[PDB]
Symmetry: D2
Subunit: 461 residues, 4 copies
């Protein structure tokens, strides 16, 4: 009824995950509406350029763009075993006056391929502000936490202190590259236009009695009507399936970024340092994003393979595949960005869990700070280094062998050797003094790189 | 209605491609009904093993296996953000008596993982007879055409003659390897059974007051009820997702086979030697098979990646992915097998086209046999080789430079140097003499390898 | 030099990673020596079946199996742009008496494909005992640690306790499935044998003057000489490239398993519960490397899938360059991973006092039901007790997250006279060995029923 | 040997396929010379910026950039189990005065990552002119063959005529999209620069005693010394591995293009319409087969960096290292080989016009029937009636072809039928192949003038 009977398989991307907006863009109502819209634009342009098409035929066509008899369309397709021709017949039935001029000069891909290009670009236009919003919410988080010291991890082992906001900027930088990629692909998408069966426009040239200029005009007119700046000069029957690679490749790369970000979030949730928005709390949304982002990456192999084995001016082995992977890649991407937005709005941070971890690990990373202090006081770097080695091993043994807390500072405190440095210990181990340039980097990044990127999307934040 | 509104995305695998039977196996009806079947079996087993579950509670559960309020379950899941708990609640709603004991001792995966294993095996069982049927129909074609000479192709260039039937056996053999793969994975599939939250059955042990024999018997009892010969001993929360790799990998390899087979048919269609069953005729069914087969191959990277990053006793980042890739792999495989059967039932061959192509190419492959005939006629191999070489270059130029028919045999016939073999030319150029052991290979293959494999189906 | 001068690219798989044994299996010496071995076996069988081949011709070839002039071969291949014909000519140069009968009746794939099948089987035979050894070492660890309680993880969040040994069985099981896979593919690998240019044996049938029996005998005999139980009946020019899918698919699956296992170890290394074999701060670098290589193993499966899908008719040569890369690389990658995993599995470091601490911080939240059950057994209510134990768990969780302190939930219960009926039981109720379920029982049954039978064939090489 | 002894595995990419120039770029000599060049630049800039480095330390480091003791470095790496530190120690041993300031403040990635970025960019600079050269050769072919009619193929079945040159433009267009992608990735490549252990420059900030300006100057000074216009602001330990996805994705899409082009060439070769250049009746399209084989590996390799980036934890994990040693080099050596081979193919492509012409003659009559019907309607005949008469003749001709294995005799059937007497005198004209190719010829001209030549202009050299 809505997403269908439960007695048959229903894609989870439709019934469970994707927004109504993205679902509609990949719906048959939208597909077949656009087929008629393209047929109308064709008749309109053809009428202007002199072909015998009456205003009645245009008005009739224009008044039935939504008037789609799916039952009739289905029966015709069972009969003809051809989907475009099924719809040509069905459109001509409710438009009896224009029936004879519908699809005039065109091959099936005039509606099929141009609709897919309109769908791709409209789908890209849906993703962009959703991605932009996720980036803005994280940028707010990053700026807010820019100076909050946190344990750094390499090999997922204790490393030089970063900040929560600086770490957030690694996430933001990858998503920003995705925003630029998606925009580039949307902006550079070209219209197939009117090209004919094998790309030569032979049909249209005959209809215009050899007038090459009128053929070029028609192609320009339908392109403009479709809202595209530019059409291919060169096609076979179809737009080059290299286009489908370009689109799904940028979505795949977005998948990898989201999977990385959400893996980091899941690890922070184990560490109790950060948690998804409101005893056992599971980072289920981040896990979902990983799950769906993995499918995005997997799907890139479909268009790669498809384009690689397209023979000459077209083989029809692209069709069933594209029905699946194009829609599912955008429905998957839509779901991910909707969820990441929801995650990024109220990430819970626990400063005192973060501080406890730093206090347990920083003493082992601060030994050169201690030597420097003792040497400046007039001690020996060689004598000091030995003393710290032993006390550090003692502390390490407590942590590993006994499961105790790190007591290195306490050992240094009660050892008389470090007499000239006892009053400095609190300053020397101040975690903010160990975070390098993290806060200055966050500011400069957001200002120079992030905010300029977001400016176009302020309207819808 | 049945597939839903055209105002929303609908999977073409559902609305366009897969059979009703496969669509039902991956339907929410079948799934949640099976969830309830597993709860019934559990309560039955747990009752036999002494837990406080009454007969009338079990009657209540059995009477309601199909009575599923999908609207309520969706209301609960919106509220609980937990799918299995929503169905526990909803089953407990229409079963007020048994409500207290549904899911007793189980974790979510008890219904979720076991249902997937039941579904995977049922799906495999739907595929197997269809694949056997394709093989059977192709075997019929291979037998009928076992001796029909046809131009061999290597580098897709003219090569040593094969037969139509022998070439078909290349196709059959790959599909036989798939049939064996699918049957193995089906037969080796193990039930998760009752394992508790992290795989230790700590819940059931406590319910049975430390009695291990009862905990093992429960696992055995529910496994048997589900009709599985064997259950896992070792699990985390889930069955190992390596299982999903094993299943989709064999599906991926089936895809590769069908893509190659259908690519060959498409090329033969261009050559006008073969056509799909009944001016332009397009091998559309073969093209669609290729299209879908490619998706089957692509899908293997999903379970590979999933398994690689499951942490400890399980992470929930397998869940959304599996909802998509498992169903799709099987619905795609189903479609391909349904279409491949259609293709295999009336393949059209054009012997006269096949013959004409052999006549254009065989003379170039027949020159060593002409030379052999001259040598034994009291002649020189080196002289003949040079004479035959110039005429073969002459004929090759007519073909490529003049777009003409190959006239090499006519050139040989009129050149008096070949007087010692002129009377043998009809014999020397008989295409059936050039196919080597192709028909005998077909006979032995079908007899020894194919027919024994089909005998159970 | 051994791996060439540093002024050109050199594969890390050869210069850095794989064992010498696996490198040699994928060497040109081994390849081209096997070409010659195959030529000798063909001449042997042909002579037996009556073709005009002499004992001295066979003696000559046998004497020169290893006497490969690589420079001459390269020179000839530059002239002929054909690798097999280059080696036919080179072999005939050093075997002048045999030159005329080398490769008699055969197409190039007689040496190319059959050598690849010999290599694949030999390569699997190198991997098998290495995996068996990894499984056995982990099985020893699993038995040793079968009762050692450890915090369970689902969502990587605290869950019902498992044991260190039981968790190891999750890893072992996957590798046992791989071991079975590799053995199956190895055992079921069929020989191409002698098949001719398009698979019809037309050349051989003519040589034997139409005697079908003799062609069938030839194929049997060379298959037997190469040590294979079974040859294909049906081929085009090549063995079906579906074979390459079957082999690299099992390697890909092994890759996923090792990636999972080594990710778990790296996570245990962060938690300080387990470390790699022998400093305070240590990196799981070997596990990281195994993950890095395992990923390449999974990636490589798409090569033979694609290759097989677009082979036209009796074969196209677009498989050749690809197979030179992916078959060797997959095995060199797999070999390295198993060499490293063996090393990781020997002396895995465990820290029971870190494990215990973590358990004590998390168990009380998972033990509330037991503390309630004990009150109801004493005489208290379950509705009343569940509420009072709720609020204490709330404050303890807040101490952990808001204060950043230790879990004081058991102290809150201890210092509260409502839980007076059960105060003396608290240690018994919180005994972590009482929460591990059937973990240790499962380890024993698994090892005895599933693991040890698999390992028994490999006992002499352990 | 020079590729090593035949007793061990040797990559066919080095031993067999790639050019010596691309082999050199991914060689250890080039890698470790660049490590030392980077150490020289770090010291140079550090000296200028006031750190205690002498001129004879710099004179020493500069004079030993090529004097690499690989044996010593290998010994050191076995001992340290650390490749970078082995080379710090080895470089310090031949530069004993400078030993104590080599790598000052830096982490291993300073040399590791920056060298990889230098190599990636130099690798892309080798490919670019090669791809431009292929496009240029193909454009000459397209121009020469712009108007030559050839049978169109859709479903790989006879379709509306195109031209040899127009079909070549489908190939050219995909390669032009690749040239733009590679150029884009190359230009947008950012330097990692000096970032420290976890990306915070804490080491350098200390060395400059809190002077942030000097840390920023150092990052700019080395970035500029390396010939890069821009450095990252935000890194962890490493440059984001999304960079590797971006680079191998464009190579993967290039593989798809080449696989399609070479598949078409292989099909044309079967049809005897086109052949690879002469280096002879049975000829195999072996170069094109090889290109398809390698292209496939290029497409396969994209899943490596996708997976790598998706599971990088925090400021980095070392599970990327081994994978990248394989896939980055292999992708570029594979790409290099394809382009070398494709240029070779494109240089003397052979066309057989009489074969092409014969195929057209066999197939065109069946596509000419609508045009014959139109000429009869113009002469006074009924469309419906004429369609029926011509349909029987057409079905008779198709049966001669398929059932008798004969030549298409449809035109002869029409010529001797008195029914078609009104158009008999027009048949020669109605069946002219050039008249069926539509705008194919003008499309080649416009495409080459507007979209190809401007892209090639910069590469003139
Ligand atoms: O415009 C034409 O019809 C000309 C034809 N090109 C085609 N162009 C577009 N669609 C075509 C084409 N051919 C078939 N079909 C129809 O597409 C449908 C494919 O079904 P599916 O494989 O399920 O996606 C399915 O309905 C097919 O009938 C050509 O010969 O070049
Ligand atoms: O036995 C034959 O030669 C018959 C031929 N089949 C072939 N079988 C095996 N190898 C062949 C074949 N053809 C070429 N080549 C040679 O393979 C080599 C391919 O080189 P690469 O692409 O670099 O791997 C390269 O050396 C090629 O020359 C056929 O026409 O069916
Ligand atoms: N450990 C678990 N086992 C089974 N299901 C779970 C678990 N944790 C959460 N879930 C639920 O499983 C579903 C996952 O949804 P999805 O990510 O869309 O597959 C959600 O309803 C979760 O609440
Ligand atoms: N954080 C790091 N950055 C760079 N290199 C490292 C780091 N940690 C270890 N290494 C070294 O990098 C090399 C990784 O080797 P492989 O995994 O074979 O590429 C080894 O020599 C490691 O010791
Ligand atoms: O909800 C469950 O069934 C399991 C949850 C978990 O393991 O965290
Ligand atoms: O050895 C290094 O350069 C870095 C090591 C680390 O980050 O752990
Ligand atoms: Cl059109
Ligand atoms: Cl359970
Ligand atoms: Cl069709
Ligand atoms: Cl052979
Ligand atoms: Cl390390
Ligand atoms: Cl640095
Ligand atoms: Cl060749």
């Amino acid at each position: 009824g809505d997403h269908g009977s439960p007695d048959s398989y229903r894609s989870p991307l439709a019934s469970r995950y994707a927004s109504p907006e993205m679902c509609f863009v990949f719906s048959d109502r939208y597909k077949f509406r656009t087929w008629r819209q393209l047929w109308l634009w064709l008749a309109e342009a053809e009428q202007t350029l002199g072909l015998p098409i009456t205003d009645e035929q245009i008005q009739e066509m224009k008044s039935n763009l939504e008037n789609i008899d799916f039952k009739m369309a289905a029966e015709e397709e069972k009969r003809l075993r051809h989907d475009v021709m099924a719809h040509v017949h069905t459109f001509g039935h409710c438009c009896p006056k224009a029936a004879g001029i519908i699809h005039l000069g065109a091959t099936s891909c005039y509606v099929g391929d141009n609709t897919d290009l309109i769908i791709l670009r409209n789908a890209l236009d849906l993703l962009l502000p959703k991605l932009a919003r996720v980036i803005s919410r994280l940028a707010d988080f990053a700026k807010e936490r820019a100076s909050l010291p946190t344990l750094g991890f390499t090999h997922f082992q204790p490393a030089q202190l970063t900040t929560v906001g600086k770490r957030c900027c690694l996430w933001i930088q990858d998503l920003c590259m995705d925003l630029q990629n998606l925009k580039r692909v949307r902006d550079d998408l070209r219209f197939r236009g009117v090209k004919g069966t094998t790309g030569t426009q032979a049909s249209f040239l005959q209809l215009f009695e050899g007038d090459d200029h009128k053929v070029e005009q028609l192609d320009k007119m339908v392109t403009e009507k479709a809202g595209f700046k530019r059409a291919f000069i060169i096609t076979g029957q179809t737009y080059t399936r290299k286009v489908d690679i370009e689109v799904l490749s940028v979505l795949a790369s977005l998948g990898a970024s989201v999977h990385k970000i959400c893996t980091d979030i899941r690890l922070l949730a184990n560490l109790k340092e950060m948690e998804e928005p409101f005893y056992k709390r599971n980072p289920m949304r981040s896990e979902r994003c990983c799950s769906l982002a993995r499918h995005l990456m997997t799907l890139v192999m479909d268009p790669l393979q498809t384009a690689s084995v397209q023979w000459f001016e077209r083989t029809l082995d692209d069709s069933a595949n594209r029905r699946i992977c194009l829609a599912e890649a955008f429905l998957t991407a839509d779901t991910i960005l909707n969820t990441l937005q929801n995650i990024s709005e109220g990430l819970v941070v626990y400063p005192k869990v973060i501080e406890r971890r730093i206090r347990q690990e920083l003493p082992f990373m601060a030994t050169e700070n201690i030597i420097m202090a003792m040497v400046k006081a007039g001690g020996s770097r060689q004598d000091c280094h030995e003393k710290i080695r032993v006390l550090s091993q003692q502390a390490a043994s407590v942590v590993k062998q006994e499961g105790g807390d790190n007591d290195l500072i306490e050992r240094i405190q009660v050892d008389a050797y470090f007499s000239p440095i006892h009053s400095q210990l609190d300053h020397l181990l101040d975690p903010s003094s160990f975070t390098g340039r993290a806060s200055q980097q966050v500011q400069r990044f957001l200002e120079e790189e992030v905010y300029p990127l977001l400016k176009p999307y302020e309207s819808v934040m």
